[PDB]
Design a protein around this ligand. Structure first.
Ligand SMILES: O=C(C1CC1)N1CCN(c2ccc(F)cc2)CC1
Length: 460
């Protein structure tokens, strides 16, 4: 039975509004309702992995697992295996997989982050799960960020705290946060970003939603505007939104948006908004294709509608050769030529690089680079032809061309990372000097760039 080179992944996010679900929620897992929906002809085809994020979830883990498993069994006639479940307060993540995947899945990690301080610590934050699927690392984050139209900067701060402090994936990747640890990272939840239009325009917005005219609303969506200004979710993707705002509904129908200020809302307006979102970030040149992104129309117990997204994702096999794992394969090598880092820092320490990859037996430290002053007042760190030749464990091009090298640029004085990035080995040619490039980030914000050339030798 062959190992897959693609899987499909279902991502669900639902703020349940502290109410139990209705008896039937199958529409969610079938990607049916509004937006980019799944074809009816696929209804019986199970996804490989289902990742369910809830917020304001009033159920026990046991109660929700029973509902999820019985839902999927009704759709697919398959009894899914529970990979992981993790709950912080009323924020929960469940990962389910087809039984045939049980011995393909390992290194399961869970963690949570509590956001805020004092007043603002106690109900917002994130949960996450990571694991290996054969040769591919997968990470999943469900976050419930700060509410309220006038708190976009708090939401951005919540995002930075979650990506700094959520401890998932390979702990040996010490310079890297979750935005670099995974082949594929999915980040979803009630992100709570609002449509920033005046309160007086509520009925106008409602009119536009009834006409299915979302363009003048999406141009004021805080998540899209903050992402375009590089304030949050740098280097993440989101499918185009083609479904109505998923908040705030009157319960037990979808015919009414409940936007007016009430004692129950702290006298805040809740203009119709796309609070409930799915974003992703995959390593360069790995296959990832969104095949659905939408909301259900028939699940009305909450003041939010459930959101679904599905993806094709490239995966690789657990490779064995005569040589690696457990030794190098002298027929393979990675050379970095004429490399330089450009950093936004004011610091004048010397810097060195670390190269991390699961194609190496362990990470590789470079010599210090040569600092020059850039024309427009930046730091340029030159490595020239001084970088260590990297010795992969396996030389087979079917393996090596699918790998990635994570790069950290670290201060010699403090050994702290000033920037992290990733280079694909999916090159146009081997034995050939080719340009490489990554942006560098630290705590998920842009700190610089790394560019130069690579020369990859495989056994072929
Ligand atoms: O406690 C252990 C022992 C290794 C320490 N496991 C629990 C999680 N396991 C799991 C794997 C795939 C899967 F799809 C579901 C569950 C198996 C391994």
């Amino acid at each position: 039975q062959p190992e897959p080179d693609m899987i499909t992944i279902f991502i669900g996010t639902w703020n349940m509004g502290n109410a139990p679900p209705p008896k039937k929620i199958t529409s969610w897992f079938l990607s049916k309702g509004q937006g980019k929906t799944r074809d009816d002809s696929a209804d019986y085809i199970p996804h490989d992995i289902y990742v369910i994020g809830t917020q304001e979830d009033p159920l026990s883990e046991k109660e929700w697992l029973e509902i999820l498993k019985h839902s999927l069994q009704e759709i697919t006639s398959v009894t899914f295996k529970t990979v992981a479940i993790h709950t912080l307060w009323n924020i929960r993540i469940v990962v389910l997989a087809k039984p045939e995947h049980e011995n393909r899945i390992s290194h399961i990690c869970t963690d949570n982050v509590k956001t805020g301080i004092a007043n603002t610590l106690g109900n917002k934050g994130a949960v996450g799960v990571s694991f290996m699927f054969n040769g591919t690392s997968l990470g999943f984050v469900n976050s419930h960020l700060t509410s309220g139209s006038e708190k976009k900067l708090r939401r951005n701060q919540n995002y930075m705290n979650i990506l700094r402090f959520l401890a998932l994936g390979d702990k040996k990747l010490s310079p890297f946060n979750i935005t670099h640890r995974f082949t594929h990272l999915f980040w979803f939840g009630d992100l709570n970003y609002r449509v920033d239009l005046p309160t007086w325009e509520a009925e106008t917005i409602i009119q536009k939603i009834k006409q299915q005219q979302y363009a003048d609303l999406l141009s004021h969506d805080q998540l899209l505007t903050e992402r375009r200004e590089q304030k949050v979710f740098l280097h993440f993707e989101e499918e185009e939104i083609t479904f109505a705002p998923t908040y705030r509904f009157e319960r037990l129908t979808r015919d009414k948006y409940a936007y007016t200020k009430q004692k129950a809302t702290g006298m805040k307006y809740n203009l119709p908004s796309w609070c409930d979102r799915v974003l992703w970030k995959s390593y360069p040149l790995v296959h990832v294709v969104c095949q659905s992104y939408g909301s259900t129309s028939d699940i009305m117990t909450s003041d939010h509608s459930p959101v679904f997204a599905t993806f094709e994702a490239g995966v690789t096999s657990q490779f064995v050769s005569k040589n690696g794992p457990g030794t190098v394969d002298s027929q393979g090598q990675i050379e970095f030529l004429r490399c330089y880092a450009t950093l936004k820092t004011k610091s004048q320490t010397k810097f060195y690089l670390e190269f991390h990859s699961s194609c190496l037996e362990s990470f590789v430290k470079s010599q210090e680079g040569e600092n020059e002053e850039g024309s427009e007042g930046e730091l340029v760190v030159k490595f020239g032809e001084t970088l260590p030749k990297l010795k992969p464990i396996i030389s087979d091009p079917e393996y090596l061309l699918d790998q990635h090298i994570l790069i950290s640029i670290k201060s010699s004085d403090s050994d702290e990372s000033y920037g992290e990035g990733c280079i694909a080995l999916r090159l146009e040619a081997t034995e050939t000097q080719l340009p490489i490039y990554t942006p560098l980030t630290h705590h998920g914000e842009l700190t610089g760039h790394f560019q130069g050339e690579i020369k990859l030798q495989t056994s072929q």
